[PDB]
Design a binder for this molecule. Structure first.
Ligand code: OUW
Length: 158
């Protein structure tokens, strides 16, 4: 079903996360963590205090796909366990709960445009680009269901 998913996404905010490599998305999926540049860290912390759910939608650059999406479960914090990101300077660490670890090809989202990025297709956007509520909700609902996920515990964090 999609009903608990819709509940988690009701009045959520959505952000496009672009990773230079698959390894960082894999660490994020394994450890439930993300870290970004301070300009985006400040935006995510503001959004986390302002919305019932803040959703990060991940895309590896040059992959032509999204690799899943996740909900912020905390603001960023420093001094936790170190994360061996593959880098080419990162802020704190956000804890995240994954909502879907399955891929979605950009060919499947070509009908969705993001008003906050000049109504360009939602796949287009810099790291940290906010996706407007309706576009972001329909993008998340496009993903194949991830039957390994139970949103019951995520609902309890809202
Ligand atoms: C896990 N976080 C990253 O890989 C990242 C890298 C970056 N510049 C290379 C900017 C924001 N985030």
């Amino acid at each position: 079903g999609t009903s608990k998913l819709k509940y988690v996404l009701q009045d959520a905010r959505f952000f496009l996360i672009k990773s230079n490599n698959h390894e960082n998305v894999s660490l994020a999926k394994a450890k439930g963590v993300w870290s970004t540049l301070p300009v985006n860290e400040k935006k995510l912390n503001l959004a986390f205090r302002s919305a019932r759910s803040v959703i990060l939608i991940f895309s590896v650059r040059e992959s032509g796909k999204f690799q899943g999406f996740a909900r912020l479960s905390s603001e960023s914090h420093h001094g936790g366990s170190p994360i061996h990101w593959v880098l080419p300077m990162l802020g704190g660490v956000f804890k995240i709960d994954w909502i879907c670890r399955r891929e979605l090809p950009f060919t499947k989202s070509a009908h969705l445009t993001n008003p906050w990025n000049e109504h360009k297709p939602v796949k287009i956007g810099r790291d940290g680009q906010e996706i407007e509520l309706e576009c972001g909700t329909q993008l998340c609902l496009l993903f194949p269901p991830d039957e390994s996920i139970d949103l019951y515990q995520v609902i309890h964090k809202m």
